[PDB]
Amino acid sequence: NERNISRLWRAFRTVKEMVKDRGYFITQEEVELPLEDFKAKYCDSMGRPQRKMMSFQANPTEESISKFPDMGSLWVEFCDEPSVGVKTMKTFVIHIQEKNFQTGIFVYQNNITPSAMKLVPSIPPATIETFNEAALVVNITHHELVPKHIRLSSDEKRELLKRYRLKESQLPRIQRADPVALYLGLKRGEVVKIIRKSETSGRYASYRICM
């Protein structure tokens, strides 16, 4: 019961990296928060993790808001209830809506009730995404053979389609449920620039449109 603190601290780091990679403001120094510091701030006087102290909000960076004018705020919740029931989910949904968050990242420990799951798409235009803690211990996008995926702005996409005489329907595709698409929270119509980690320039990358 000490290696579970370490696993949580690592899941925490991955969530921060995911949010940073999506274009929200999180410092790398924060992403790299030392284990001791984590214990000192997010664990109680007896040394036990209090996930309710970990939840946080994130806003777009200045560079992101200029490219994505309609990009809103994001809320990350680490559920303190192992198996998430309908009532626990509803209170999370209520928070997202009332505080006007555009995206809600819902991290859970073991599972989420079927009834609870029925609430994920209940508050448009906001979207809620769910992630299992065990899957966040290691950042799947940090693998050497997984290239860098970067979402293009509407302007960039238009410029791409114009430069190559193509309709968006003629671009290589990426499935909505693709593991990297899920990581970035991609939506139908968005395009990602793909840069192999073996190449040393963002030039000639590949492009895929989300389904």
Contact (CB, 8 A) for 137 and 109: no
* Rounded Cα distance, 211 and 206, in Å: 16
Q: Kindly state the tokens that stand for 82.
A: 């192992």
Rg (CA), the chain: 18
* Residue 154 C-alpha from the chain's centroid: 20
Q: Class for domain 139-211, per CATH?
A: alpha beta
Is it true that the peptide bond before 125 is cis, omega within 30 degrees of 0? yes
Handedness of CA 41, 75, 128, 99 (dihedral sign): positive
Task: Return d(Cα 190, Cα 209) in angstroms, integer.
Answer: 6
Taking residue 71's Cβ as centre, other Cβ atoms within 10 Å add up to 19
Q: Which amino acid is at 199?
A: E
- Domain boundaries, given as residue ranges, for the chain: 1-138, 139-211
Distance CA 170, CA 184 (A): 22
CB atoms within 10 A of CB 11: 23
The candidate with the shortest Cα–Cα distance to 16, out of 105, 121, 89, is 105
Tokens of 2: 């000490």
The domain made up of 1-138 is a member of CATH 3.40.1340.10: yes
Q: How many CB atoms lie within 10 A of CB 172?
A: 10
Tally the residues of the chain.
Answer: 211
- Give the method of determination: X-ray
Asked whether the beta carbons of 88 and 111 are under 8 A apart, the reply is no
Reported structure resolution in angstroms: 1.9
Give one DSSP letter per residue of 8-61, joined into a string. HHHHHHHHHHHHHHTTB---HHHHT--HHHHHHHHB-TTS-B-GGGT-EEE-B-
Cβ(188)–Cβ(176) under 8 Å?
yes
Report CA-CA distances (Å) from 209 to 60, 86, 134, 175, 195: 22, 34, 29, 8, 15
